[PDB]
C-alpha cells in the first residue's frame, strides 16, 4: 500500500565542454516520465503522467525544470573549478528526489546526491548537507550552494508541498495501472550443478504483476529449503520474471513440484510437477544442440 515516487537524474561530464543529463521518474515500479538530454520537453510514458495538474500548472513546473537543467550543468562545471585539482573529469552525478506515501495524510520527502558513484550530499530541512564520511573538499562547494537562498526556498517548497500534492493526484490518475493484475506463467528446465552427479532444477516464472510472488519447490507438503529465490528481472511490457532453483542429486527429481502463489491467480496456485506429461511435451519443444552453453 506504500508507494515511493522517485525522480532520478543522471548527469555525465566528460570534460570542461561535453556533458549530458537524462532523467526518469517512477511511481513504485511504473515509469511515468522520461527526459532525454536531446529533448526540450519532459515526456509522458503513461496517459495519466500529468496527475491532477492542469496544462497551465504543468507548464509552470516544466519551465522551472528547464531552467534548472541549464543551470545545474554550469553550476557543476563551476564547483569543479573550485575543487581543482582534488576533483577532475570525467564526473558522474546522480540525483534521487521524491516522496513516499504513508497511510493517512502523511509523507516524508528526500533529495540524495551521489558523486562518482557514491552517496555524498542530501537536502535536509533548509540546507544542503554532506553525509558522514563525505570528503572534506566538498565543504566549500556545499557552502557556496547554501549561499543561494532562492534555490533553497524553491527546493523546500518542492519537497514539503509540491511532491506530496502531485503524488496524491498521481495515485488517483494511475490507480487502474497500479492495481493491474497480470497472471504468471511457469515452465521447468534443468542444468548440471557445480557438484558432481547433481542437477540444478530451474522453475521460470514470467509475466506477473504486481511484483510480490511466492515460488517454492515442494515434495508434497514439504518446502525444499535448498530453494534459491533469484532476483526480479524486468520484462519489456511492465511485468516481472523470477527464477527459483534447486540443487538435487541426479535421480531425485521425480516427486518434485514447483508451486507459484500470486494475487492474480485468485487462490488457484500454479503447480508444476517435474516428470509429468505436460513437462515431457514442454521439454521436447525446447530441445537444442547445447552449443555455447554456460559452465553449469
Amino acid at each position: 500500500k506504500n508507494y515511493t515516487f522517485r525522480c532520478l537524474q543522471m548527469s555525465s561530464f566528460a570534460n570542461r565542454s561535453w556533458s549530458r543529463t537524462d532523467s526518469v521518474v517512477w511511481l513504485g515500479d511504473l515509469q511515468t516520465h522520461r527526459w532525454s538530454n536531446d529533448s526540450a520537453t519532459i515526456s509522458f510514458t503513461k496517459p495519466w503522467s500529468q496527475g491532477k495538474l492542469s496544462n497551465q500548472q504543468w507548464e509552470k513546473l516544466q519551465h522551472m525544470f528547464q531552467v534548472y537543467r541549464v543551470s545545474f550543468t554550469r553550476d557543476i562545471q563551476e564547483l569543479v573549478k573550485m575543487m581543482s585539482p582534488k576533483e577532475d573529469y570525467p564526473i558522474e552525478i546522480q540525483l534521487s528526489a521524491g516522496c513516499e506515501m504513508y497511510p493517512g495524510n502523511a509523507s516524508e520527502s528526500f533529495l540524495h546526491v551521489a558523486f562518482q558513484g557514491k552517496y555524498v550530499v542530501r537536502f535536509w530541512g533548509t540546507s544542503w548537507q554532506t553525509v558522514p564520511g563525505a570528503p572534506s573538499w566538498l565543504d566549500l562547494p556545499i557552502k557556496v550552494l547554501n549561499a543561494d537562498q532562492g534555490t533553497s526556498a524553491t527546493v523546500q517548497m518542492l519537497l514539503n508541498d509540491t511532491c506530496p500534492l502531485f503524488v496524491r493526484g498521481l495515485l488517483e490518475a494511475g490507480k487502474s495501472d497500479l492495481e493491474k493484475q497480470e497472471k504468471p506463467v511457469a515452465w521447468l528446465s534443468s542444468v548440471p550443478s557445480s557438484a558432481h552427479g547433481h542437477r540444478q532444477l530451474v522453475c521460470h516464472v514470467s509475466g506477473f504483476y504486481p511484483k510480490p510472488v511466492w515460488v517454492m519447490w515442494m515434495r508434497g507438503d514439504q518446502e525444499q529449503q535448498g530453494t534459491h529465490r533469484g532476483d526480479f528481472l524486468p520484462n519489456a511490457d511492465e511485468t516481472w520474471y523470477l527464477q527459483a532453483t534447486l540443487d538435487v542429486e541426479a535421480g531425485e527429481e521425480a516427486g518434485l513440484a514447483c508451486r507459484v502463489k500470486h494475487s492474480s491467480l485468485g487462490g488457484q496456485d500454479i503447480i508444476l510437477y517435474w516428470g509429468s506429461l505436460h513437462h515431457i511435451l514442454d521439454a521436447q519443444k525446447m530441445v537444442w544442440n547445447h552449443r555455447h552453453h554456460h559452465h553449469h
Partner: T-cell receptor, first 113, second 112 residues
Framework: TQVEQSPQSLVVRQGENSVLQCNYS??????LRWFKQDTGKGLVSLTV?????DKTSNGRYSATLDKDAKHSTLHITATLLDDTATYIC?????????????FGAGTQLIVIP | EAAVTQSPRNKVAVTGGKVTLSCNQT?????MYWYRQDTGHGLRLIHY???????EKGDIPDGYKASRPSQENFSLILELATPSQTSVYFC??????????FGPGTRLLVLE
C-alpha cells in the same frame, strides 16, 4: 547584449527628478543591482532588488523591479549636482558566487544648475 | 566595510610590451575577478579566481594571462601589449555570496 539601459544620456535641471530604465533578457535573473560610477572612479552600489515584484529605497534613490516584464526603474528625487555620473544596471544570474554579472552600458546623467 | 585596491592607477605601455596590473584585497575573500570597461559596452569579464593558485578564463580571455599567488593578491598580465588593450581595468572580490566589491580602476594606454 542582454542588458539594455534607457536613455543613453539624460540632462536634468538641479532639484528636478530623474527616471532611468533597464530592460534585460538574462536567464535566470536572481537579482538586479544599480551602481553609480562617478567619472574616473569605480562602481558604488546604490541598491539591490531580489523579489519577483520588488521596490527599494536609499535616501533620494528609489528603484523598482518586475521580473515578468524583465524591467527595472531607478528614480532620483531632487537631483543634486553630485548626482552627475554614469548609472549602471547589473543583473545577477545566481544567488551566490556561482553566478555571472551581466552589465548594462550605463546611462550618463548630467545635472545642470 | 569591504574594499579592494588596484595599482597602478594609470599606465602607459608600447605595442609588444609587457604590462602587469595588480589587485590587492584584505577582506579574506576567496573569489577575485578582472573586467575591462569600454565605451558602448558593459564591464566584460576577462579572468577570475576561486582561491590561491586558481585562475579561470572569463568571457574575453584572449591576450591576457592571470595569476593568483595568494588570497590577497590577483594580477592581470599582458605578455604582448596591443593597442586594442587600451581600456579601464576593474578588479573585484567576493565571498560565497552574490556581491562583488569593485576596485577603483586602472587606466591603460597602449601606444605604437
Amino acid at each position: 547584449t542582454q542588458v539594455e539601459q534607457s536613455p543613453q544620456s539624460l540632462v536634468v535641471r538641479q532639484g528636478e527628478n530623474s527616471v532611468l530604465q533597464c530592460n534585460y533578457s538574462v536567464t535566470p535573473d536572481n537579482h538586479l543591482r544599480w551602481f553609480k560610477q562617478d567619472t574616473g572612479k569605480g562602481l558604488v552600489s546604490l541598491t539591490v532588488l531580489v523579489d519577483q515584484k520588488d521596490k527599494t529605497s536609499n535616501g533620494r534613490y528609489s528603484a523598482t523591479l518586475d521580473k515578468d516584464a524583465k524591467h527595472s526603474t531607478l528614480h532620483i528625487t531632487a537631483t543634486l549636482l553630485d548626482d552627475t555620473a554614469t548609472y549602471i544596471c547589473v543583473v545577477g544570474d545566481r544567488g551566490s558566487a556561482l553566478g555571472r554579472l551581466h552589465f548594462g552600458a550605463g546611462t550618463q546623467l548630467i545635472v545642470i544648475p | 566595510e569591504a574594499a579592494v585596491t588596484q595599482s597602478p592607477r594609470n599606465k602607459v605601455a608600447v605595442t609588444g610590451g609587457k604590462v602587469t596590473l595588480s589587485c590587492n584585497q584584505t577582506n579574506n575573500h576567496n573569489n577575485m575577478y578582472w573586467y575591462r570597461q569600454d565605451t558602448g559596452h558593459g564591464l566584460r569579464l576577462i579572468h577570475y579566481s576561486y582561491g590561491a593558485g586558481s585562475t579561470e578564463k572569463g568571457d574575453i580571455p584572449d591576450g591576457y594571462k592571470a595569476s593568483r599567488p595568494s588570497q590577497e593578491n590577483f594580477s592581470l598580465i599582458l605578455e604582448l601589449a596591443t593597442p586594442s588593450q587600451t581600456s579601464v581595468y576593474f578588479c573585484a572580490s567576493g565571498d560565497e555570496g552574490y556581491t562583488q566589491y569593485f576596485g577603483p580602476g586602472t587606466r591603460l594606454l597602449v601606444l605604437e
